[PDB]
Design a protein around this ligand. Structure first.
Ligand SMILES: Nc1ncnc2c1ncn2[C@@H]1O[C@H](COP(=O)(O)OP(=O)(O)OP(O)(O)=S)[C@@H](O)[C@H]1O
Ligand SMILES: [Mg+2]
Lengths: 101, 250, 100, 50
């Protein structure tokens, strides 16, 4: 049972990401993915025990990078969280009104 | 002029199998059954079931593939010509053609639209299938409660035939049709082996390659199909089955 | 919708049985009292009725017994229900209401 | 000692088909069933079924 978000992040970057990357053929170089952007996707979207839904997310971003190479202009996408809003679209969860003091 | 009437059919099954890329799971079982058929008399009571079983197994297409139009510039036209809006599905299709264009060989998927009735849910697949130009199909599953349509019977029964999906695949010679299940959420509860339990083994993206219909039990590859499913609301679906498939929201 | 025809005694669904009796491709089928179809313990017929009642796709109606899609575009279905509330909305969409 | 159990049973259907204007689709399925009849023995469970 279960998977804590930290462990899921570890598994993904070391197992899912290489796995889906070999399954989708994207070069390791061409579709860079920071741990930060992944952290955002974890904090805001996938908060549940299963691993599959995260697999769907990584595929979505990899897909969008593939089309942008296959027919866009850039020779590589470079996703930063400010860009993410269009790739994942509307965030589901709302970030907390993080008060300071 | 009854020049070997029992052999011409055995030859026929040869010819139909020559061109095919027979899976290794099949090629032993087939020809050994053709031998067994060659032992027994044409009027032998088993012969007309065996002649059917081969007739199915020789006939269902094996690995023939339909290369699709690839340039997307022309895809836009046909994608727009018969419907307006539905932009997100257009983008997903752009993704699909892009990725399948990337690692050479074709690959399947599953998807699941949902939203208000009459949005066009049933109305797109004919457009999509026209886009890729892979053969279309449609298959409402509303209220179905008999797994046999997905499986067939044991061949001991008179007239048993492999599940309907295979009948489609026979009817569409390419090995990669766009199968289309429809209205999944209104699928019935048969109170004894209801279809959703069956469906999960089919729809699992990874296990589908080894679907094994009970009729002819040899596993079949089925990764190349791109299934699509529809439902007017996304609550009846069992939790894993909802996990299994993409949930586009028309 | 009949049965697979591999069952011992299977015979085709109602409408086809209705149609063989009346040689027309355009009989006046008259469904009656739709509100009080059975529900809640077995496979609701309304789930199937959409296959019948689709205004355009009915032309490829598909019967378990005879698998072949059955064009019935010329038919003039009619349905009766004293109050058009028990009918689930998507089904109620297909067919124009009329109020005596 | 039979009349309509192999060929004539086939034919009366064939002649019966003419006046109808069938879609070619089901006609091909019918032609398949017709060949399968001819292959089938005159007396069998499948025969009376089909
Ligand atoms: N973007 C569109 N452009 C043109 N026609 C459309 C569009 N979207 C929907 N339609 C029309 O929608 C009608 C029916 O489409 P369906 O996809 O059958 O509707 P639906 O959402 O499947 O509703 P159901 O049958 O209750 S599941 C057709 O007559 C189409 O012309
Ligand atoms: Mg529809």
């Amino acid at each position: 049972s279960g998977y804590v978000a930290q462990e899921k992040l570890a598994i993904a970057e070391r197992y899912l990401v290489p796995q889906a990357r070999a399954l989708c053929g994207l070069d390791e170089s061409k579709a860079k993915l920071s741990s930060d952007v992944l952290t955002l996707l974890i904090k805001q979207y996938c908060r549940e025990s299963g691993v599959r839904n995260l697999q769907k997310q990584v595929e979505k971003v990899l897909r969008k990078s593939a089309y942008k190479i296959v027919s866009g202009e850039a020779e590589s996408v470079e996703v930063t969280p400010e860009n993410l809003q269009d790739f994942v679209g509307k965030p589901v969860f709302t970030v907390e009104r993080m008060y300071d003091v | 002029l009854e020049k070997d009437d029992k052999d011409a059919i055995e030859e026929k099954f040869r010819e139909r199998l020559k061109e095919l890329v027979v899976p290794k799971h099949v090629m032993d079982v087939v020809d050994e059954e053709l031998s067994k058929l060659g032992l027994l008399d044409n009027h032998s009571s088993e012969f007309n079931v065996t002649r059917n079983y081969l007739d199915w197994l020789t006939s269902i297409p094996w690995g023939k593939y339909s290369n699709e139009n690839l340039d997307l510039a022309r895809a836009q036209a046909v994608l727009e010509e018969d419907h307006y809006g539905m932009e997100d599905v257009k983008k997903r299709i752009l993704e699909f053609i892009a990725v399948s264009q990337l690692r050479g060989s074709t690959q399947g998927k599953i998807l699941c639209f949902y939203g208000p009735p009459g949005v066009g849910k049933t109305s797109i697949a004919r457009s999509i299938a026209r886009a890729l130009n892979r053969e279309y199909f449609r298959f409402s599953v509303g209220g179905m409660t008999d797994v046999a349509e997905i499986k067939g019977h044991r061949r001991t029964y008179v007239g048993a035939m492999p599940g309907k999906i295979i009948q489609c695949l026979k009817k569409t010679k390419t090995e990669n049709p766009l199968i289309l299940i429809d209205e999944v959420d209104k699928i019935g509860r048969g109170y004894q082996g209801d279809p959703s339990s069956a469906l999960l083994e089919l729809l699992d993206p990874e296990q589908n390659a080894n679907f094994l219909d009970h009729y002819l039990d040899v596993p079949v590859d089925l990764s190349k199909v791109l299934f699509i499913c529809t439902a007017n609301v996304t609550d009846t679906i069992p939790e894993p089955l909802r996990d299994r498939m993409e949930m586009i929201n028309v």
